[PDB]
RNA sequence: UAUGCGCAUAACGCCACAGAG
C-alpha cells in the first residue's frame, strides 16, 4: 500500500537479504513488461480521454 | 544427583555461561543475583525460573575481561554465605541481649 | 454536496425518460435481477460485490 | 465462581512464598485479574470485597440486599467509612509487597473478602483420550462417549477449515487412516 | 531530507516489483474455502434486524444476515426493500424539474 | 508496633 | 462441618478456639471483642471463626445407635 | 574536542502543552549567545529545574577530550577523567531526525535537530551554522549544569 | 561499588521489639529486600518440621470420614524437635527409630451410665463425645523413649478438636509422623505467618496547629501523632511512627495532604515471626538463616566437585 | 479443558502426562534412531518417554 | 506503563527485566548504555523493550526501522490547558508517534497498536521483515517482560 | 455449585452427590439468606481475594 | 473391540430431561 512504502524504503537492506533474485539469471528480466507499460503510457499520453 | 549445570555459549569464551541450579527458586536466585551484581567485573546478571512445573533456575553471568564467569558465581556464593553468617551472629547476640535484660528487669 | 433521488421500489427503464435531469450514468439499485436484465451480467456482478 | 457471575478455571496453584503479602502479614488465597471488571461491570464484587473485609474486621455481618443504598448514601461511602473506622484504607486497597522480588509494589492493591463458590464442573469429568478401541459395528468408525472410551468427531467444519489450509494428507490422515481404511475387492473389468 | 540512505529509484522499484511478484497466490490455494469462511465468520458478529426508524424523510434497508441471505442463498427477484439511487444534475433546470 | 528494646 | 484445624490463608491454629469462642459469646461479649480475646488479629484468621457454620451438631442428630 | 554544541540557556517556560509526565518536566528554553531555542525533557526527581534557571548546555560526541574513541559500551568501573566530571546532569541519546527549510538554498538559517535520550526527547533549533555536527542515527551526550547567577 | 563487608557490618543491626513464646518482632536495619525476602521465604517454606503423613485406620465409625480425618490429623502440629530426625527415604513404607514418630488415637464414645439425670447437654449425657488432641498417645518405637523424656513428644496444642462422636461411634487409628519442608505441603510449615514491613517515616513539612492537629491525629493510627498543649494551643508531632498502617487517610484530607510526607525508611525492616509451637521463633529464625547458608555451601561443594 | 500458559512458546501446546503416556506415534526403527527407541521400549507404556 | 516517558530503572532492575524477558538466549546478551549517566545511571523503560528487541532479532539481520502511532491519543496525556507555543508543533515530540531506529524504541508508548492484534505495528512489521517465527518470539518475550 | 446438599447421607441412595467439606456462612449476604435459613445448607467459602495482575496465569477468566 | 490371565467375561439404539463452551 502507498502508506507502507516508506516502511519498505527504510529497512531496505534487511529485505534484500531475503530476496536473492535481484541479480538472478531467470528473473530480473523486466524487458517485456516494462516495454508493455511504456506502450500503455504512450497510448494514454496520446489519448487523455478514454 | 548433579544439582548444578554450567551451560557455556556457542562461543567457547567461558565469559557468558548460564548456570542451571536444580531444586531452587527465587530465594537463592534473587539473593545471588543481588550479591553477584555487586561485583565490578560482571557485565550482566539475572536469573529466571524456567517453568512452574520445573524446579530449577537459569542464572546468567557475563564478565568483562579475561576472568571466566565461574569466579563471580563462586565469589557471590561466598559473599552471600558471609552475609548470612554475620546476620546470624548479630541476631543471636541481640536475642541474648533481650533475654538478659528482660529476665533481670522483672526481678 | 450533490442531490440524490432515492425511490422505494424499482423500475429501471422508467427513469430513462428523465435523462436531462438525472445522472443516469451513475444509476444504482439493490435488485441484482433488475441490473442483470437492464445493464447485463457484468454490471450485476459489481452490484453483488 | 464468585456470587456475581464471575466464573473461572483454576490455572495455577501458586506457592505461598511466591504470593504477594500485605503489610498486615497476610497473603491472599485467591488472585483475581482486574480485567474481568471493565466489560462486565460487576461493581458489586468490589462492594462485596470491601463489605466482607469490614465484616471480618469489625466482627459484623453486613446487609447486601439490593435497593437499600441510594446515590445520596452510597454503598462505597458506607463501607469506606467502616474500613476507615477499622484503621484501613477508605478505598479498599492495601500496600502489598512482592513475594518474588521482596519489594513493595508501586501500585496500591485492592484486596478484600469475597465469598467464592465451587462449581461441579471438574476437569476429572471432562478429559478424554482415544488411541485405538471399539468401533461402530456398521461403519467401523470409532464410537462416541468418554465412558465407553470412544472417539471425538472431526466434523464437517473441521474438514472445511483443514481444506482451507491446503493440507490434504492431513485430512486423509484424520478422515481415512484414522477412521476407516478398508480394502475392498473390485472386478476391474 | 537529511541523511540519505544509499537507496536509488531503480532498486526501490525493483524491490517493490519483486515483492509484488512474490505476493501472488501459490498454485494450490483453496481460495473458495477462504472466500466462504470469510463471508461466513464475520456474519456471527452481525445482529438480527436492529430496527432503526431513522425518521420519516430517510430510508431504511434490510440489514445483516437476512440481507446477506437474500444476496447469496436465495438470489430473489423480490427482495424486501427494493431501491434505486440516481444523482441529479447541477443544472438549475434540473433542480427546478426534480 | 512498639519501641524496640535493644538499642542501636 | 467441623472447625478447621488451621486458618486457610495463614497457617494459624484456629481449631482449638471454637469452644473458647462459644464460651466468650455466651458470656455476653461482642463478636469483635470475642475475636480480640482469642488473639485473632488478621481478618483471615478472624473470618475462619466468625463465619464458621458448625454442621456437625446438626449432622449428629441422625446418630444411628440412639442407645 | 568532540563538542558538537555549547551554549548557556535560560528556562523560559515549563510544560506549555500541559502534559505533565511523572518525574519528567519539559523545559522550553532560549539561548543567550545564539538564536537557539531548546525544548528539553529532564528528570526532575534527580535533577530539578525551576523557572528562570540558567544552565550551561553542552552536546558532545564523546566524553573524552583525548581522542574521540566513541565506545558506546558502559563500564561503571572506568575512573578515568571524563567531560562529565564538570557537569551535573548527563544523558546519552540518538539523533533521530534533523530538518530545516530549503528551496534550492541548503540549510537556510533554520535547522531543527531532534534527539531522543531513551524516550526523553529534545529539539535544538536555530541557525544551521551551529548545527553542523548533528546527523541522523548519531550518538550524542547531553551535558548540562546550572550556572549560579 | 563492590561488596564491602566492613560497611555492611558497620551498618547492620538487629533490634528485638518483643519476644514471648510463639511470637517475635524484631528489626533488620541495613539489609536488602533480596536477603530479607530470602529469610521470609525460608521461614515460610523451607524450615523443616514433623507432621503426620500416613494414617492407618482400623475402625472409624464416626461421621468425620476417613480421608477427611487423615488430612485433619496431618494439619496438627507435633511438638517434636525436627533437628533430631531425618528424612524418610523414598519407598520406605516402614520407618525406623531415626526418621518417624507414631501416635495412637483410640477413643470410644459411650453413654454416661450414672449422673445423667435426664439432662440435655452432651457433656453430661456422653463420655468422650469430643475427640481432642490430648487423646493422641505417643507410641515410642525403637529407643525413642530413652532419647526423649516423657511429655516431650506430644502435640503442641491439646484441645484442638479433632472430631466429635455419639455413643457407639469409635475412632481407632495410628499415625506416622515424618519430616518435611513447607514447600512440599503446608502442614510442614513452622510459622503461623512470617513477614516484614519497612519502617514508615512520617515527617511534617509544615507546623500543624489547632484543630488541624486533631484532624492530623485522627487521620493516622492511634499513637503516631502526639498532639500536645505546649502554650495551651495544640501542636502536632510525630511520636513513634512505627504504629502507622499506611491507611493513607491523610491523602483524603484536602488541606492537610500538603503538610505531611509518607514514605518508608529504605532497608529498615520489621519482621514478625509467629511460631505454631514446634520450635521457639528465635530458633526458627536461626535455622532459617542456616538454611540459606546451607544452600550456598551446597553449590560451593558442587563447584569444588566439578573442579 | 484449556488453561493458559505463558512459559511455553506461542507455537507450543502443553500436553499432560495423562495424554502423553496414551497418545502414541508409530516410529519405524532405523539404525540412526534405535538408541532412542530402545530406551523408549525399556521405559514402557507407563513411564514417559 | 513501562514505555511511558518517566519510567526509569536502575542497573539491577534493568538487567533482571531484560533477562526475564529473554528466558534462555544462546550467546551473549547485548545491552544498552544508560539513558542518564549522571547523577545516577538510569535506564528508561523504552530501553528495556529495546534491549529485548535487539536480543531477539536474528544475528545475521539488521534490526527494523518503524514509525507508527499508538492507540493512546495525545490528548489523553493533557492535564492543564495547553498554552500554544509559536514555533513548536506539539505532536512532533509526543508519545503518540512511535519511532524505532535500529531496534531502539525512541518515542511513543507501546500499546495494542504494536504487539496487539492490530496492523502495521511492531510485531506485524517483524512478521513482514523477518519470519513468522520471529513474530512468535517477539510475542513470547514481550509477554514474559511485561509480566515480569 | 458443589455445596452442602443435605444432612442424611447414609439414608440417601442417589447417583451422584456433591459435598463441600467445610462450607462457611457468607459475611455479606442479603436478609433473604437468613429468612430462608440458608445456613442450614451453605454452598461456599469466604476467601481473601486480591484483585491484582501478578502472575501471568490469570488473564482471560482464569484464576 | 476392551479388560483380566492362546484362554474367560463384557460387545446397543430411540426418546426425554439436565448441563458445558
Ligand atoms: Zn489466618
- 3-state SS of chain C is CCCEEEECCCCHHHCCCCCCCECHHHCEECCHHHHHHHCCHHHHHHHHC
E strand spans, chain I: 13-20, 23-29, 49-60, 78-79, 101-108, 110-111, 126-127, 130-131, 136-138, 154-155, 163-164, 170-180, 191-195, 198-204, 225-229, 234-238, 260-275
Chain I residues with CB under 8 Å of B94 CB are 13-16, 26
Grid cell 507555543 in the structure block, residue: K85
Q: What technique solved it?
A: cryo-EM
What is residue D130's three-state secondary structure? coil
Q: How far, CA to CA in Å, does L60 sit from each of D4, D32, D33, D35? A: 17, 11, 8, 8
Q: Show the cell assigned to D30.
A: 485467591
Coil, helix or strand for K143? Answer: helix
CB atoms within 10 A of CB I275: 23
Phi (first) and psi of residue I58, to 5 degrees:
-110, -50
Closest CA to D46 of D58, D61, D34: D34
Find the domain containing H81 and state its range.
5-149
Angle at CA D40, nearest 5°, toward D39 and D44?
135
Cell representation of residue B25: 527458586
- CB–CB of L63 and D10 under 8 A? yes
The three state secondary structure string of I50-62 is EEEEEEEEEEECC
Own/partner pairs for H26-33, CB < 8 Å, 24+ apart?
Answer: H28/K85, H28/K88, H29/H57, H31/H7, H31/H126, H32/H7, H32/H8, H33/H7, H33/H8
Q: Which of I14, I32, I293 sits opposite B85 (nearest CB)?
A: I293
Q: Which of H102, H146, H142, H108 is nearest to H122 (CA)?
A: H142
- Residue in B2, B21, B91 nearest the CB of I14: B91
B56-63 vs B42-49, strand pairing mode: antiparallel
Nucleotides of M under 7 A from a protein CB: 1-2, 11-13, 19-21
Three-state SS string across chain E, please?
CCCCCCCCHHHHHHHHHHHHHHCCCCCCCCHHHHHHHHHHCHHHHCCCCCCCCCCCCCCCCCCHHHHHHHHHHHCCCCCCCCCEEEEECCCHHHHCCC
Q: How far is CA K80 from CA B77, E53, H15, H18, K77, in A?
A: 53, 42, 9, 5, 10
SS3 I37: helix
Q: Does J23 touch chain D (CB under 8 A)?
A: yes
Q: Contact at 8 Å (CB) between B94 and I20?
A: no
CA–CA separation, I247 vs D149, rounded Å? 58
Residues K113, K68 contacting (CB under 8 angstroms): yes
Q: How many domains does chain H have?
A: 1
Q: In chain K, which ranges are E strands? A: 8-9, 36-38, 43-44, 66-68, 98-101, 104-107
**DSSP letter assigned to residue K76:** G
How far apart, in whole angstroms, are the C-alpha atoms of residue D21 and residue G42? Answer: 12
Please report, to the nearest 10 degrees, the dihedral formed by the alpha carbons of residues B85, B87, B93, B96 taken in order.
-110
Q: Is D102 left (phi over 0), alpha (psi -120 to 50) or beta?
A: left
Per the structure block, which three cell numbers stand in for H140? 550524542
Q: Give D10's contacts (C-beta < 8 A, 6+ positions apart).
A: J3, L62, L63
Q: Which set of grid coordinates corresponds to residue B10?
A: 556457542
Task: Report the topology of domain I46-192.
Answer: RNA Polymerase Alpha Subunit; Chain A, domain 2 (2.170.120)
Q: Contact at 8 Å (CB) between C19 and E93?
A: no
The answer to whether H77 touches B42, Cβ cutoff 8 Å, is no
| CA-to-CA dists, residue K105 to H71, K3, K44, K46, K77, angstroms | 21, 9, 10, 6, 19
Ligand 1 centroid to I23 CA: how many Å?
15
- φ, ψ for residue I27, nearest 5 deg: -125, 145
Compute the C-alpha angle K25/K29/K35, nearest 5°: 135
Residue D133 in grid coordinates: 478401541
Residue given cell 468418554 in the structure block: D146
**Three-state DSSP class for I13?**
strand
- Distance (Å) of CA I225 to CA A4, I203, I214, I218: 63, 10, 9, 9
CA of D25 to the centre of ligand 1 (A): 9
How far, in Å, CA of I290 to CA of I83, rounded?
12
Q: How far is the CA of I246 from the centre of ligand 1 (A)?
A: 21
- For chain K, domains (ranges, CATH) are 1-148 (1.10.274.100)
Backbone angles phi, psi at D64, to 5 degrees: -120, 25
CB D1 within 8 A of CB G18: no
Distance CA H57, CA E54 (A): 63
What pairing do the DSSP bridges indicate for beta strands D114-117 and E84-87? unpaired
- CA-closest candidate to residue G55, choices I135, L18, L5: L5
- Which residues fall within 8 angstroms of residue I117, CB to CB, at 6 or more apart? I124
DSSP string, H2-14: -EEEEEEEEEEEE
Of E23, G16, K147, D109, residue with least CA distance to I132: G16
- Of the candidates B16, A35, L22, the one whose C-alpha atom is nearest the C-alpha of residue I72 is L22
Angle (deg, nearest 10), helices K11-21 and K132-147: 140
Q: Which of H124, H142, H137 is nearest to H84 (CA)?
A: H142
Go through chain E and list every residue after which a break occurs, taking a C to next N gap over 2.5 angstroms, comma-separated.
none
Taking an 8 Å cut-off on Cβ atoms, the answer to whether K144 and J9 are in contact is no
Long-range CB contacts (< 8 A, 24+ apart) of J15-20?
J16/D127, J17/J48, J18/D127, J18/D129, J19/D127, J19/D129, J20/J48
What three-state secondary structure class fits H31? Answer: strand
Chain D residues whose CB is inside 8 A of the I186 CB are 16
Report whether I216 contacts G35 (CB < 8 A).
no
Q: Which residues are I110's β-sheet partners?
A: I127
Q: CA–CA separation, I267 vs I74, rounded Å?
A: 38
Whole-number Å distance between alpha carbons of K1 and H6: 35
Q: Quickly count: other Cβ atoms within 10 Å of residue E2's Cβ.
A: 14
Distance CA B95, CA H116 (A): 55
Run of H or E residues at B33: helix B26-36
- Kindly give, in sequence order, each residue whose CB lies less than 8 Å from that of residue K85, ignoring residues fewer than 6 positions away: H13, H16, H17, H28
Q: How far is the CA of I294 from the C1' of M11 (A)?
A: 62
Give the Cα separation of D19 and I41 in Å (integer): 10
Cell 441484482 locates to C32
Nearest-CA neighbor of H88 among K37, E81, B93?
A: K37
List all chains that touch chain E, counting a touch as 3 or more CB pairs closer than 8 Å.
A, C, D, H
Which residues lie below 8 Å from residue G23, measured CB to CB, with a gap of 6+? Answer: none
Rounded to whole angstroms, the Cα distance separating E37 from D56 reads 54
Q: List Cα–Cα distances, F5 to B94, I17, I23, I267, K36, in angstroms.
A: 10, 5, 15, 20, 44
CA D177 / C1′ M1 distance in Å: 18
Contact C42, C49 (CB under 8 A): no
Indicate the burial class of I37 (C-beta count within 10 angstroms; 0-12, 13-18, 19 or more).
Answer: buried
Q: What is the 3-state secondary structure (H, E, C) of chain J?
A: CCCCCCCCCCCCCCCCHHHHCCCCCCCCCCCCCHHHHHHHHHHCCCCCC
Ranges of H-type helices in D61-113: 75-85
The 3-state DSSP class for residue I294 equals: helix
Question: How many beta carbons lie within 10 A of that of residue E11, not counting itself?
Answer: 13
B47, containing H or E segment: strand B42-49
Q: State the Cα–Cα distance between residues K36 and K42, nearest whole angstrom.
A: 5
Question: What are the φ and ψ backbone dihedral angles of H29, each rounded to 5 degrees?
Answer: -110, 175
H or E element: which one contains B22? strand B16-22
CA distance I51 to chain F (A): 33
Residues 6+ apart with CB under 8 A from G64: I168, L10
Strands of the I170-180 sheet, one edge to the other: I49-60, I170-180, I101-108, I136-138
| Contact with chain B for residue K32, Cβ under 8 A | no
Query: Which residues numbered 14-73 in H keep a CB inside 8 Å of some CB on B?
Result: none
Resolution (A): 2.7
Q: Tell me the three state secondary structure of residue D152.
A: coil
| Centre of ligand 1 from the C-alpha of residue L48, in Å | 10
DSSP code per residue over H87-140: -SEEE-EEEEEEEE--SSSTT-S-EEEEEEETTEEEEEES-TTS--S--TT-EE
In this complex, do D100 and B52 lie within 8 Å of one another by their Cβ atoms?
A: no
Query: What is the C-alpha to C-alpha distance for residues A30 and K114, in angstroms, rounded to an integer?
Result: 37
**Any bridge partners for residue D116, and if so which?**
L45
**I76: nearest Cα among G8, G13, G17:** G13
Which nucleotide is nearest, taking the CA of residue L61 and each C1'?
Answer: M21
Rounded-to-integer distance, Cα I168 and Cα G63, Å: 9
Q: Residues D76-105, buried b or exposed e (16+ Cβ, 10 A)?
A: bebbbebbbebebbbbbbbbbbbbbbbebe
Chain G nearest-CA distance from D43, in A, is: 23
Burial of K14 by CB count in 10 Å (0-12 exposed, 13-18 middle, 19+ buried)? buried
Q: CA-CA-CA-CA torsion for I22, I27, I28, I29, nearest 10 degrees?
A: 180
Residue A12 has phi, psi (to 5 degrees) of -70, -40
Contact of B52 with D12, CB cutoff 8 Å = yes
Per DSSP, what are the bridge partners of residue H24? Answer: H43
Looking only at the bridges linking them, the beta strands covering I170-180 and I198-204 are unpaired
Three-state secondary structure call for residue K123: helix
Residues in chain K: 148
User: Is residue H1 helix, strand or coil?
Assistant: coil
Name the residue in chain B with its Cα closest to that of F7. Answer: B94
The angle at the Cα of D82, spanning D80 to D86, to the nearest 5 degrees, equals: 110
Query: Do E2 and H137 count as a contact with CB atoms less than 8 A apart?
Result: no
Ligand 1 centroid – CA D24 distance (Å): 11
Q: Please tell me the distance from the alpha carbon of residue H137 to that of residue D159, in angstroms, as a whole number.
A: 52
Contact predicate D47/D19, CB 8 Å: no
**CB contact at 8 A, I16 and D85:** no
Structure-derived torsion over alpha carbons of residues D145, D150, D156, D160, reported in degrees to the nearest 10: 130
Examine chains K and B and say if they touch (3+ CB pairs below 8 A). yes
| Total length of chain B | 107
Measure the CA–CA gap between B9 and B15, rounded to whole angstroms: 8
- Report residue B36 as a C-alpha cell: 553477584
Q: Residue H110: exposed, middle, or buried by beta-carbon count in 10 A (0-12, 13-18, 19+)?
A: middle
What is the Cα–Cα distance from D106 to K147, expressed in whole angstroms? 15
Residues E85 and C4 sit within 8 Å (Cβ to Cβ): yes
E29/D166 CB distance under 8 A: yes
Amino acid at each position: 500500500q502507498p502508506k507502507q512504502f516508506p516502511f519498505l524504503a527504510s529497512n531496505y537492506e534487511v529485505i534484500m537479504k531475503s530476496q536473492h533474485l535481484h541479480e538472478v539469471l531467470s528473473r530480473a528480466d523486466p524487458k517485456k513488461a516494462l516495454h508493455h507499460f511504456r506502450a500503455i503510457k504512450k497510448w494514454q499520453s496520446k489519448h487523455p480521454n478514454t | 544427583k548433579t544439582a548444578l549445570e554450567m551451560v557455556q555459549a556457542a562461543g567457547t569464551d567461558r565469559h557468558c555461561v548460564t548456570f542451571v541450579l536444580h531444586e531452587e527458586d527465587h530465594t537463592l536466585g534473587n539473593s545471588l543475583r543481588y550479591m553477584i551484581m555487586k561485583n565490578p567485573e560482571v557485565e550482566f546478571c539475572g536469573y529466571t525460573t524456567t517453568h512452574p512445573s520445573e524446579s530449577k533456575i537459569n542464572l546468567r553471568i557475563q564478565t568483562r575481561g579475561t576472568l571466566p564467569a565461574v569466579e563471580p558465581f563462586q565469589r557471590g556464593l561466598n559473599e552471600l554465605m558471609n552475609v548470612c553468617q554475620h546476620v546470624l551472629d548479630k541476631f543471636e547476640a541481640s536475642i541474648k541481649d533481650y533475654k538478659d535484660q528482660k529476665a533481670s528487669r522483672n526481678e | 454536496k450533490e442531490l440524490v433521488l432515492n425511490t422505494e421500489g424499482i423500475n429501471l427503464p422508467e427513469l430513462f425518460k428523465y435523462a436531462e435531469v438525472l445522472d443516469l450514468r451513475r444509476l444504482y439499485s439493490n435488485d441484482i435481477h433488475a441490473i442483470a436484465n437492464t445493464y447485463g451480467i457484468e454490471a450485476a456482478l459489481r452490484v453483488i460485490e | 465462581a464468585s456470587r456475581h457471575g464471575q466464573k473461572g478455571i483454576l490455572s495455577r496453584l501458586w506457592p505461598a512464598e511466591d504470593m504477594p503479602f500485605t503489610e498486615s502479614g497476610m497473603v491472599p488465597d485467591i488472585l483475581f485479574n482486574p480485567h474481568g471488571f471493565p466489560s462486565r461491570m460487576t461493581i458489586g464484587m468490589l462492594i462485596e470485597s470491601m463489605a466482607g473485609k469490614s465484616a471480618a474486621l469489625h466482627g459484623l455481618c453486613h446487609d447486601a440486599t439490593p435497593f437499600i443504598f441510594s446515590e445520596e448514601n452510597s454503598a462505597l461511602e458506607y463501607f469506606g467509612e467502616m474500613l476507615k473506622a477499622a484503621g484501613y484504607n477508605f478505598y479498599g486497597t492495601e500496600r502489598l509487597y512482592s513475594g518474588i522480588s521482596g519489594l513493595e509494589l508501586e501500585a496500591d492493591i485492592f484486596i478484600g473478602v469475597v465469598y467464592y463458590q465451587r462449581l461441579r464442573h471438574m476437569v476429572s469429568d471432562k478429559f478424554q483420550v482415544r488411541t485405538t478401541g471399539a468401533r461402530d459395528r456398521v461403519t467401523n468408525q470409532p464410537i462416541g462417549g468418554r465412558n465407553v472410551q470412544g472417539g471425538i468427531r472431526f466434523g464437517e467444519m473441521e474438514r472445511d477449515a483443514l481444506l482451507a489450509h491446503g493440507t490434504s494428507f492431513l485430512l486423509h490422515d484424520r478422515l481415512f487412516n484414522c477412521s476407516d481404511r478398508s480394502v475392498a475387492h473390485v472386478c476391474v473389468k | 531530507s537529511y541523511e540519505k540512505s544509499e537507496l536509488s529509484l531503480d532498486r526501490l522499484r525493483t524491490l517493490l516489483q519483486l515483492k509484488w511478484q512474490r505476493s501472488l497466490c501459490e498454485p494450490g490455494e483453496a481460495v473458495g474455502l477462504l472466500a466462504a469462511q470469510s463471508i461466513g465468520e464475520p456474519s456471527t458478529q452481525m445482529t438480527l434486524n436492529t430496527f432503526h426508524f431513522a425518521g420519516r424523510g430517510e430510508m431504511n434497508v434490510t440489514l445483516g444476515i437476512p440481507r446477506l441471505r437474500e444476496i447469496l442463498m436465495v438470489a430473489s427477484a423480490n427482495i424486501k426493500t427494493p431501491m434505486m439511487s440516481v444523482p441529479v444534475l447541477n443544472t438549475k433546470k434540473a433542480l427546478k424539474r426534480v | 508496633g512498639n519501641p524496640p528494646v535493644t538499642g542501636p | 462441618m467441623i472447625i478447621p484445624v488451621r486458618c486457610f490463608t495463614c497457617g494459624k491454629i484456629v481449631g482449638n478456639k471454637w469452644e473458647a469462642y462459644l464460651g466468650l459469646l455466651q458470656a455476653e461479649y461482642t463478636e469483635g471483642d470475642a475475636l480480640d480475646a482469642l488473639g485473632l488479629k488478621r481478618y483471615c484468621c478472624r473470618r475462619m471463626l466468625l463465619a464458621h457454620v458448625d454442621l456437625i451438631e446438626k449432622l449428629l442428630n441422625y446418630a444411628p445407635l440412639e442407645k | 574536542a568532540g563538542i558538537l554544541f555549547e551554549d548557556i540557556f535560560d528556562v523560559k517556560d515549563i510544560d506549555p502543552e500541559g502534559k505533565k509526565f511523572d518525574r519528567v518536566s519539559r523545559l522550553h528554553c532560549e539561548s543567550e549567545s545564539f538564536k537557539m531555542d531548546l525544548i528539553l525533557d529532564v528528570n526532575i526527581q534527580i535533577y530539578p529545574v525551576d523557572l528562570g534557571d540558567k544552565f550551561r548546555l553542552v552536546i558532545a560526541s564523546t566524553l573524552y577530550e583525548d581522542g574521540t574513541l566513541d565506545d558506546g559500551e558502559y563500564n561503571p568501573t572506568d575512573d578515568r577523567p571524563s567531560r562529565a566530571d564538570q557537569f551535573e546532569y548527563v544523558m546519552y541519546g540518538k539523533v533521530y531526525r534533523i530538518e530545516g527549510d530549503e528551496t534550492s538554498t541548503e540549510a537556510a538559517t533554520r535547522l531543527s535537530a531532534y534527539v531522543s535520550y531513551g524516550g526523553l526527547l529534545m529539539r535544538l533549533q536555530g541557525d544551521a551554522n551551529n548545527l553542523h555536527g548533528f546527523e541522523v542515527d548519531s550518538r550524542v551526550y547531553l551535558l548540562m549544569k546550572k550556572l549560579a547567577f | 561499588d563492590a561488596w564491602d563487608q566492613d560497611r555492611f557490618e558497620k551498618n547492620f543491626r538487629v533490634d528485638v521489639v518483643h519476644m514471648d513464646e510463639n511470637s517475635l518482632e524484631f528489626d533488620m536495619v541495613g539489609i536488602d529486600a533480596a536477603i530479607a525476602n530470602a529469610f521470609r521465604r525460608i521461614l515460610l517454606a523451607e524450615v523443616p518440621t514433623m507432621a503426620v503423613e500416613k494414617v492407618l485406620v482400623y475402625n472409624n465409625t464416626s461421621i468425620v470420614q476417613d480421608e477427611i480425618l487423615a488430612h485433619r490429623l496431618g494439619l496438627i502440629p507435633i511438638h517434636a524437635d525436627p533437628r533430631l530426625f531425618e528424612y524418610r527415604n523414598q519407598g520406605d513404607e516402614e520407618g525406623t527409630e531415626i526418621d518417624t514418630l507414631q501416635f495412637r488415637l483410640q477413643v470410644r464414645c459411650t453413654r454416661n451410665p450414672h449422673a445423667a439425670k435426664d439432662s440435655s447437654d452432651p457433656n453430661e449425657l456422653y463420655v468422650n463425645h469430643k475427640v481432642y488432641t490430648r487423646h493422641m498417645t505417643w507410641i515410642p518405637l525403637g529407643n525413642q523413649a530413652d532419647l526423649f523424656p516423657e511429655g516431650t513428644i506430644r502435640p503442641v496444642h491439646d484441645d484442638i478438636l479433632i472430631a466429635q462422636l455419639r455413643p457407639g461411634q469409635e475412632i481407632d487409628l495410628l499415625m506416622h509422623c515424618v519430616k518435611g519442608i513447607g514447600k512440599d505441603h503446608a502442614k510442614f510449615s513452622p510459622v503461623a505467618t512470617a513477614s516484614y514491613r519497612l519502617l514508615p517515616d512520617i515527617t511534617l513539612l509544615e507546623p500543624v496547629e489547632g484543630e488541624a492537629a486533631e484532624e492530623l491525629s485522627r487521620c493516622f493510627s492511634p499513637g503516631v501523632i502526639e498532639v500536645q498543649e505546649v502554650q495551651g494551643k495544640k501542636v502536632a508531632r510525630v511520636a513513634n511512627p512505627r504504629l502507622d498502617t499506611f491507611s493513607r487517610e491523610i491523602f483524603r484530607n484536602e488541606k492537610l495532604k500538603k503538610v505531611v510526607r509518607l514514605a518508608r525508611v529504605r532497608d529498615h525492616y520489621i519482621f514478625s515471626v509467629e511460631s505454631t509451637g514446634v520450635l521457639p521463633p528465635d530458633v526458627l529464625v536461626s535455622e532459617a538463616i542456616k538454611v540459606l547458608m546451607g544452600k550456598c555451601r551446597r553449590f560451593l561443594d558442587e563447584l569444588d566437585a566439578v573442579q | 479443558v484449556i488453561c493458559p500458559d505463558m512459559y511455553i512458546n506461542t507455537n507450543e501446546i502443553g500436553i499432560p502426562m495423562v495424554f502423553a503416556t496414551k497418545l502414541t506415534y508409530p516410529q519405524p526403527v532405523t539404525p540412526w534412531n534405535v538408541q532412542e527407541l530402545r530406551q523408549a521400549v525399556i521405559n514402557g507404556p507407563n513411564v514417559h518417554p | 506503563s513501562m514505555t511511558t516517558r518517566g519510567c526509569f530503572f536502575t542497573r539491577e532492575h534493568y538487567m533482571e527485566l531484560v533477562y526475564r524477558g529473554l528466558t534462555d538466549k544462546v550467546g551473549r546478551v547485548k545491552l544498552l548504555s544508560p539513558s542518564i549517566l549522571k547523577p545516577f545511571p538510569l535506564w528508561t523503560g523504552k530501553q528495556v523493550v529495546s534491549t529485548l528487541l535487539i536480543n531477539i532479532i536474528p544475528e545475521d539481520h539488521i534490526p527494523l526501522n518503524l514509525s507508527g502511532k499508538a492507540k493512546i491519543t495525545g490528548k489523553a496525556w493533557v492535564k492543564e490547558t495547553p498554552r500554544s507555543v509559536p514555533g513548536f508543533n506539539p505532536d512532533s515530540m509526543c508519545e503518540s508517534q512511535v519511532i524505532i531506529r535500529e531496534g531502539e524504541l525512541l518515542c511513543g508508548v507501546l500499546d495494542k497498536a504494536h504487539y496487539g492484534s492490530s496492523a502495521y505495528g511492531l510485531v506485524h512489521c517483524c512478521y513482514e521483515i523477518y519470519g513468522g517465527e520471529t513474530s512468535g518470539k517477539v510475542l513470547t518475550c514481550l509477554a514474559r517482560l511485561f509480566t515480569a | 455449585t458443589m455445596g452442602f446438599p443435605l444432612l442424611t447421607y447414609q439414608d440417601r441412595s442417589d447417583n451422584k452427590l456433591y459435598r463441600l467439606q467445610t462450607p462457611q456462612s457468607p459475611l455479606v449476604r442479603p436478609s433473604m439468606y437468613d429468612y430462608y435459613d440458608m445456613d442450614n445448607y451453605p454452598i461456599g467459602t469466604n476467601a481473601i481475594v486480591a484483585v491484582i495482575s501478578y502472575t501471568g496465569y490469570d488473564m482471560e477468566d482464569a484464576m
